[PDB]
Each structure stands twice: as structure tokens, then as C-alpha cells.
Design an enzyme around this catalytic site. Sequence first.
Site: not given
Ligand SMILES: C[C@]1(C(=O)O)[C@@H]2CC[C@@H](O2)[C@@]1(C)C(=O)O
Ligand SMILES: [Zn+2]
Ligand SMILES: [Zn+2]
Length: 315
Positions: A67, A69, A96, A99-100, A128-129, A177, A225, A252
Site C-alpha cells: 500500500d 496511500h 491501495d 486515500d488516507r 480495496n481503496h 492486495h 472488518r 492490506h
Molecule cells: C487502514 C488501511 C486502509 O484503510 O486501507 C491502511 C493501513 C493498513 C491497511 O492500509 C489498511 C487496513 C487497509 O485497509 O488496506
Molecule cells: Zn487494503
Molecule cells: Zn490500505
Amino acid sequence: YSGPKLEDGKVTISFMKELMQWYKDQKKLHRKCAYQILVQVKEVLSKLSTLVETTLKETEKITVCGDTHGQFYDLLNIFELNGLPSETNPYIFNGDFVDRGSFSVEVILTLFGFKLLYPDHFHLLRGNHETDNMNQIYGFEGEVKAKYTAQMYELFSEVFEWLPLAQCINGKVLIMHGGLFSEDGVTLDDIRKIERNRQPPDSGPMCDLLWSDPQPQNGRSISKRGVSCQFGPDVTKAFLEENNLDYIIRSHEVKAEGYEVAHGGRCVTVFSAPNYCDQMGNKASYIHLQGSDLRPQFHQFTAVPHPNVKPMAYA
Ligand SMILES: C[C@]1(C(=O)O)[C@@H]2CC[C@@H](O2)[C@@]1(C)C(=O)O
Ligand SMILES: [Zn+2]
Ligand SMILES: [Zn+2]
């Protein structure tokens, strides 16, 4: 406008160099150029299988990142530590990208430019993002609307739907991922046949690929989740056996050291966002693999300075 421009309407190495510097300096690529990149890369991505299959010859290497992000300045640091992408220095980024972090636009347009310049040696997998639901809450949709328009965001959403979901190197290492499946018996051909040009379902293998996590105990559990499951070492062993694979590499989950090796060696996590959200204090890593030896080699790194914009500022 005196910024980066395509040459005869196509990406070149000299354009990519101009763009990374433009972005490092907090500048914006002209909407017309961003458009040409998005339409050209949709075209390239839409021709690919859901399962990308890559052969690495015995003198060839490849780098796997987790990731990112929207941490654009840590992305630059990966290219400085590990070299620019090229025909002799290929990359896989494992979901990913957005995002974030608050430089998601800079991260995604740099990744797309390199995909256009080196289509056979630069690989992007969906996380997933890379989905509407997530972008709408966690910052990317807000960032694109702020720098460009709603229309541009719609084009991005359409491009993301064409990202492949997994990659298999030399029929031995599978890379996704999230992870493995809520049901036994899924095969590589099942993955190839996923019709992926869509937002993912609430259940089923496209959901699992983007969302699942490993657990230490045998079995499966309902995921904390709220989607997909936790899968035990019994699940991993059974999946590798059926598909004649050695191990899997997934992302992830944040790890304090940047990586983790679970299931007795069979389920590797790689995470490429150091000091995640300016708070976690974690290290990050990338993996090297070589055609002559596919066991993972971990390279750790730590967070570099970035401009003063807070995480989720656009969320
Ligand atoms: C919090 C995270 C996110 O939102 O994607 C971010 C931090 C770990 C991983 O990447 C995570 C859990 C994920 O969903 O892939
Ligand atoms: Zn993820
Ligand atoms: Zn992530």
C-alpha cells in the site's frame, strides 16, 4: 501553462522526469494532459487479463510494493532508493495507491505515466481503496474534485475498474492486495475469468481478493472488518497445493517492521507506506524477487519529509 507536455501526444521518459519534479514542487499537470493519460491508460488496461501472468527470465528481477496511500514523497524515495522503473527495472504496485494520504493525485498520475511508458514492465493491481465507496469517505474523491473536477473523478473511477486483481510470477508466486477465499476450491483459471470491470460485490472471490486477512489459528472466522473472512494456515496450504504455487504475497495490513511472514512462510504481507498517516511510526518495505530465486528479499525503509498537508485533509 509552462508545465510538462506530451510529445506528439505520448508519454516519454523526458516527460516523466519533468512530471515528478513538477509534483515534488506542488504543481498541477494541465487537465488536457491528465485526460490524455487517463484515456490512453484505460485503453492499455482494458486489454489485460484479470490475472496478469509474467515470466521472469533467470537474469531478470522485479520489485513488489504494498500500500502507498497517497504518500507521494515516500513514493519518490522508493524510486531514489531502488531506481527508476525501466525495461530492466520492473515494478508491481499491489493496490491501495490512493486515500488516507493527501498526495493521492500525484501518486496515481505518476503510476499511470509509467504504466504508459513501460506497459510490459510496470504493473498495477487493484486494492480495496481503488473503488467508489472507499474514495467517497477516505479522501481521493475529495482530492480530485479539489484539483480538477467531478468529471475527472468519474474518468478515474472508470480507469480503476480495468485494474487487474492479481498477478502470477513464473506460475509460482501469486500476488493480490487482500488475500485468499471464503470458500475452498478457488483456482487460477477462476481468477482469470472474473469479470472485473465493476465495483466489487459484497461477497465472493472478487471481494475476498481485495478484502481478506490471515489469522494464526486453523479455520476461518467472520472478519472484524464486516466483509470477507480471516483465513488460517490450513486454508493457505490447501490453496497453494491445488494451484501448484509456492506462496502468496499480499498487503492490506499495517506492520510495525514493514512486512510479516505468517503461515509458516506461505503468506507474506508487504506494506509500503512508512509512518502511516503520520502517526503509526511503522517502517515500510518492498520485496525483490529474481528469476533464478523467487524467495522474498525484504528491503526496509522509513518516512521522508513532505509538505505540511495533514492526512485525510480532503476526506
Ligand atoms: C487502514 C488501511 C486502509 O484503510 O486501507 C491502511 C493501513 C493498513 C491497511 O492500509 C489498511 C487496513 C487497509 O485497509 O488496506
Ligand atoms: Zn487494503
Ligand atoms: Zn490500505
